[PDB]
Design a protein around this ligand. Structure first.
Ligand SMILES: Nc1ncnc2c1ncn2[C@@H]1O[C@H](COP(=O)(O)OP(=O)(O)OP(=O)(O)O)[C@@H](O)[C@H]1O
Ligand SMILES: Nc1ncnc2c1ncn2[C@@H]1O[C@H](COP(=O)(O)OP(=O)(O)OP(=O)(O)O)[C@@H](O)[C@H]1O
Lengths: 201, 201
């Protein structure tokens, strides 16, 4: 049982970086290729990166690529760009996981899931990653998801189907911030659901 | 002798596909990573690509990366974008080779060299690749290049130094078309010159 299969991670911030580390450490299986796409640099406030050795001002993705040194047997590719309506061709592979934050992310998330499912990729993304540590992380297909969750509401109005959602279901409006423990939990679950989708391919 | 270092080929058409194929069949050394960057899709006119099994409509770079299957012990990365003054970030690693054609290529060529050399990459590009078959292929540093050549002239005007040019010297003003043999011979010397730059690093 060797690696096979390509996972693209659009978004490699505090969450996506955890997802990348988890996928990169997989043995007896998991993906052969990991593509990570994010336009942002490591800042002072990115302690989880700096604690692992990233320098302030280094592209996120380039740090993550750097961990797959000469000899590493999976392929890790980082592309230091934001996904826009204009570079969807950066998206294919076998599974596409969207873990982006900042601004309004729903129209791009929708454009990413269409394009990828068009090309035959299974899709997964988050539905709220707020929490103080003591929240459950749940997983639901889009057509069972809570229609009061703004993320599910938006994706269901965009007529998205066969799309996995992970997270705590707490969002920016309500009071809880984002703690590292909640992100570790959501990352673990996300990794497990990516591997299920990878098997389905 | 083992694979080490990264080469970036900006442009992967008739000529840059040939230098890719060369670098990807190196053994007992050569680069560890080959990064191929080109915005263009394979067309019916691209026979070299078609005869090697590419489908019309495929990005040139996805094709190239596809040849590097599971098991391949160097890493090949295809980024299906044109370099512009906005995404120079894609430019990095140990050698960057510019083999682009099609419209306004001397500004973007200048910007790539300066941006690459500032991040410490060694740089190489073409100086005319027209010819009917046996014309000499010469190699020359920018500061030794003949200022009758419009490419040399442009780069010298822009104060480019420590920059290797390779080609036949024949340009649009010459009566010659571009033939597949002249490309093979320019690709072969390009490959040799990249390997020199890679060792010196
Ligand atoms: N269009 C997009 N394409 C690629 N990446 C994007 C896009 N929009 C945002 N991002 C990336 O998503 C990442 C969000 O990471 P960030 O650390 O800010 O939040 P997070 O991982 O959700 O964790 P937290 O829950 O702590 O905010 C950033 O690195 C950002 O660059
Ligand atoms: N700004 C750019 N960045 C990346 N690639 C580019 C850029 N501009 C042009 N190119 C690429 O340069 C390649 C040139 O390929 P093309 O087959 O047309 O000419 P060639 O390699 O010089 O061969 P010939 O000498 O027969 O014309 C194209 O695939 C094109 O997409």
């Amino acid at each position: 049982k060797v690696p096979h299969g390509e996972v693209t991670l659009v978004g490699a911030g505090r969450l996506g970086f955890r997802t990348a580390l988890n996928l990169m450490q997989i043995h007896r299986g998991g993906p052969e290729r990991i593509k990570v796409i994010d336009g942002q640099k490591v800042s002072a406030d990115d302690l989880i990166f700096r604690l692992m050795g990233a320098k302030i001002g280094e592209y996120k993705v380039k740090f993550i690529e750097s961990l797959a040194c000469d000899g590493f047997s999976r392929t890790v590719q980082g592309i230091p760009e934001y996904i826009t309506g204009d570079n969807l061709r950066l998206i294919g592979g076998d599974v596409v996981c969207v873990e982006i934050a900042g601004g309004d992310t729903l129209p791009i998330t929708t454009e990413i899931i269409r394009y990828a499912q068009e090309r035959g990729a299974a899709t997964i993304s988050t539905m709220g990653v707020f929490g103080i540590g003591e929240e459950d992380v749940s997983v639901v297909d889009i057509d069972e998801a809570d229609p009061e969750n703004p993320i599910a509401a938006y994706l269901q109005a965009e007529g998205i189907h066969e799309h996995v959602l992970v997270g705590t279901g707490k969002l920016i409006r309500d009071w809880e911030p984002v703690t590292p423990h909640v992100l570790d939990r959501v990352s673990e679950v996300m990794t497990a659901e990516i591997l299920k989708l990878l098997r389905g391919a």
